[PDB]
Every structure is written in structure tokens, then in C-alpha cells.
Design a protein around this ligand. Structure first.
Ligand SMILES: O=C1CCCC2=C1C1(CCCCC1)N=C(Nc1nc3ccccc3o1)N2
Ligand SMILES: Cc1ccc(C)c(OC(=O)c2ccncc2)c1
Ligand SMILES: OC[C@H]1O[C@@H](O)[C@H](O)[C@@H](O)[C@H]1O
Length: 391
């Protein structure tokens, strides 16, 4: 009974009802954008590396209608949202630009509106709902940024590219939520497809849609139900650390750097600096193998790379925590688990376990009553990206 069921028809239903009640009318548009689990490729995106996320059935829905009066009126019904649940503001102009503040959940919608590249953007009324656990490491913020962006395209079609929309959503994250993220979470929330993982090349911005085509197996996502303080603080520190190496090795990005390179050039960089880049340059290689493992149906190599990916995160990148360490070591003990790791930024959030669909229900007995803290489970079919339903 720890396993949360998606209930996506219900989430749209609740969003419509709450719109009709709040604004006096049926909403004209529904949009959705999913949260994400990163199978492997941790802390590689911002080092121009490779990531292998898939989109979750956990999503953010905006239901809404254009206004004439050039203002934005928002209601969120998400339980975890900080108060107030409602915010109204005028559209930004040459004169007045939006600014982050209170409430925080609105900062994501403001940021996307502030950097939306097309015109003219009319005002709108919208209800915001999400089944993505808020700050639980499955990209609630990217799904609300991308759900917002998708709603704005219905108001004012952009004439742009998938990467342009990801960088808009990424800019809102940087400027309005003070989180200097890579492109992974936005890219996956835009481009996900049911029954596929998405290999992203964060140097070239090439993307591959890789079938998840053994249904014998599952990905179990485990919510540790913690966020440590160091989370917010440490993500940029790591990022600045990766960039100092790249300075010192005359590389424009760590991507360009290979493990033979870094071992021969230690003297050039810090002992921390060398171990930060040892993850990244290590990780990027492990992903490329994990992609090529997935296509060959080599579940057991992908598994083992995954554990390497955790051990590099835990020991070299130091962005795991005892709770994650303990959900991973606990998963890796269960026969038919190919692999387990922390996913996303770390310091709390979720693990992702690759295992047999028959073995998965053994785990949720076991994890719940052999996990120090409280487990929540998602059994994730790989899902669609950003979607529109005309109402
Ligand atoms: O405070 C933090 C720390 C950083 C991680 C982060 C949280 C909070 C920020 C604002 C409210 C409190 C939780 N929210 C999100 N994301 C998000 N808030 C949403 C609201 C409605 C719909 C979808 C949403 O996704 N991320
Ligand atoms: C990394 C990897 C390698 C191989 C396989 C078969 C993988 O899993 C799926 O194909 C799959 C996952 C979840 N739901 C359905 C299918 C994953
Ligand atoms: O794999 C680490 C990831 O951490 C995420 O939470 C962040 O939003 C991504 O851009 C990426 O840096």
C-alpha cells in the first residue's frame, strides 16, 4: 500500500472541476508535461555529456483559457504548494518584467512567461495540478515549466525547436527558481515517448528514442521521502568544480576529456577536482555503454554500469546520502534486481531499480519494512512527453 497509482484521468478531472468552480466557466485547453527518472547519466548534462532518462506517468496538468485583459490568474490545487494557492500578475512588458518571489511554485510559471520567445502572448486563467512528488527528485519543476510552455504555445504558437523550448524552461529554472540546472529534465519532459527511454547528447543535442522492449522487466522508483539541506547548496558547488578542471585541462567541457587524459593530468588539478571529473568522464562512458546495453537487451551490463553510476556518485561525486546508499545496497541484495542507483541530483529524492516485473512486488514488501525511513513506490511504464487536449 506504499505504491502510488498514477490516476491520470482523475488528475485532469480534478483540474477541470476546480477551474469551473474558480473562474465561472469550462476551461478551453488541457496540457500535460511529465516528471522524469534518469536511468543513468547523473551529473553529466551540464558537462555536455550523455543522459538516459525516461518520462513518468507522474505529470503536471494546466487547464485554462485565454483572457483579453493581459493578466495571468493562477490557482494551484497541489497539496505541497506553498501559500497562497493563487497568484495574479500582469504580463511582463518592455516597461515591467516579472520577478521571482512568493509563492515559490509560481516562480516557474513566471519564468517561462518572462522568457517565452513568441508574441503576442495574451493573458490567461489556469488551474495547475501535479502527481509529481514536489521536490522528491522526479523533476516536478521541469514538468510545471514544460506544462506552462506547452500552454503558452496554444495561446501563441512559437516557431522554434525542441532545444529552444528546453533552454527557455531551463532559463526560468536558473533566473526564477535560483537552480542552475542542465537541460536533462526539461528535454525529457518535452520529448518523452511512451515505451521509450531518451538518450540525450547534451553536446550536439541529438536525441535517440530507445524502445523499452522487454516487458518481462520493470523500473521501480523509490522515494526516500527525504531532502537534505546540502541538496540546494551542493549542486552548484559540483558544477563550479567540474568547470575548474575544464579550465585547467584546456578543455571547453569535460565531454572532450577521456579517463586516460585525466589520469595523466592529475598534477594540473585539485584532489577533489580530479575526483569530481573522474565521476563525470567516467559516467559519460558508462551511459554510452548503458544505451548500447539496452538496445542489445543486455539488461545485466546496464544493471552493473548503474551500480558503478551509484558508486561514482556516492564516493567520487559525493551527492548520495545514507538513505539513498541504503535503498541501493538494499535493492542490490534482491535476486532479479539488475541494478539500482540514486536518480536525479541526489542528497535525497528517489532511487531507480531495474528488475523483473514478477520480482518487483517482492521489493515493496522488503524495501518498506527493511528501509530506515518511509518508502513510496512508483512502478513506472515509460510515458509520453508534453501533450495537448482541446476541451
Ligand atoms: O521548495 C522546493 C525546493 C526545490 C524543489 C522544489 C520545491 C517546491 C517549490 C514550490 C512549492 C514548494 C515545493 N516545488 C517544486 N516544483 C513544483 N512545484 C509545483 C507546484 C504546482 C505544480 C507543480 C509543481 O512543481 N520544486
Ligand atoms: C536499461 C535497460 C536495458 C534493457 C531493458 C530490457 C530495459 O528495460 C526495458 O526494456 C523496459 C523497462 C521498463 N518497462 C518495460 C521495458 C532497460
Ligand atoms: O543528473 C543530475 C541532474 O540533477 C537534476 O536534478 C538537474 O535538474 C539535472 O539538470 C541534472 O544536473
Amino acid at each position: 500500500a506504499a505504491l502510488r497509482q498514477p490516476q491520470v484521468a482523475e488528475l485532469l478531472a480534478e483540474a477541470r472541476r476546480a477551474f469551473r468552480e474558480e473562474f465561472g466557466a469550462e476551461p478551453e485547453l488541457a496540457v500535460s508535461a511529465p516528471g522524469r527518472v534518469n536511468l543513468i547519466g547523473e551529473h553529466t548534462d551540464y558537462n555536455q555529456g550523455l543522459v538516459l532518462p525516461m518520462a513518468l506517468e507522474l505529470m503536471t496538468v494546466l487547464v485554462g483559457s485565454p483572457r483579453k485583459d493581459g493578466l495571468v490568474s493562477l490557482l494551484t490545487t497541489s497539496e505541497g504548494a506553498d501559500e497562497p494557492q493563487r497568484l495574479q500578475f500582469p504580463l511582463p512588458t518592455a516597461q515591467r518584467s516579472l520577478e521571482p518571489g512568493t509563492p515559490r511554485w509560481a516562480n516557474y510559471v513566471k519564468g517561462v512567461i518572462q522568457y517565452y520567445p513568441a508574441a503576442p502572448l495574451p493573458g490567461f486563467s489556469a488551474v495547475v495540478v501535479s502527481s509529481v512528488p514536489l521536490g522528491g527528485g522526479l523533476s516536478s519543476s521541469a514538468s510545471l515549466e514544460v506544462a506552462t510552455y506547452t500552454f503558452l504555445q496554444q495561446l501563441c504558437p512559437d516557431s522554434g525547436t525542441i532545444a529552444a523550448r528546453a533552454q527557455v524552461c531551463q532559463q526560468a529554472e536558473h533566473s526564477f527558481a535560483g537552480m542552475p540546472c542542465g537541460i536533462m529534465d526539461q528535454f525529457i519532459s518535452l520529448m518523452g515517448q511512451k515505451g521509450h527511454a531518451l538518450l540525450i547528447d547534451c553536446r550536439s543535442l541529438e536525441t535517440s528514442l530507445v524502445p523499452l522492449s522487454d516487458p518481462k522487466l520493470a523500473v521501480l522508483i523509490t522515494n526516500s521521502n527525504v531532502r537534505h539541506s546540502l541538496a540546494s547548496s551542493e549542486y552548484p558547488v559540483r558544477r563550479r568544480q567540474c568547470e575548474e578542471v575544464a579550465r585547467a585541462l584546456g578543455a571547453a567541457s569535460l565531454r572532450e576529456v577521456q579517463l586516460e587524459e585525466l589520469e595523466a593530468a592529475r598534477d594540473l588539478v585539485s584532489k577533489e577536482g580530479f575526483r569530481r571529473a573522474r565521476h563525470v568522464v567516467g559516467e559519460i562512458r558508462r551511459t554510452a555503454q548503458a544505451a548500447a546495453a539496452l538496445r542489445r537487451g543486455d539488461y545485466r551490463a546496464f544493471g552493473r554500469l548503474m551500480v558503478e553510476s551509484h558508486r561514482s556518485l556516492r564516493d567520487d561525486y559525493e551527492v548520495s546520502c545514507p538513505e539513498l546508499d541504503q535503498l541501493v545496497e538494499a535493492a542490490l541484495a534482491v535476486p532479479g534486481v539488475y541494478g539500482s542507483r540514486m536518480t536525479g541530483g541526489g542528497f535525497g529524492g528517489c532511487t531507480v531499480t531495474l528488475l523483473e516485473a514478477s520480482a518487483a512486488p517482492h521489493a515493496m514488501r522488503h524495501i518498506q519494512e527493511h528501509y530506515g525511513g518511509t518508502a513510496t513506490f512508483y512502478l513506472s511504464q515509460a510515458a509520453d512527453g508534453a501533450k495537448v487536449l482541446c476541451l
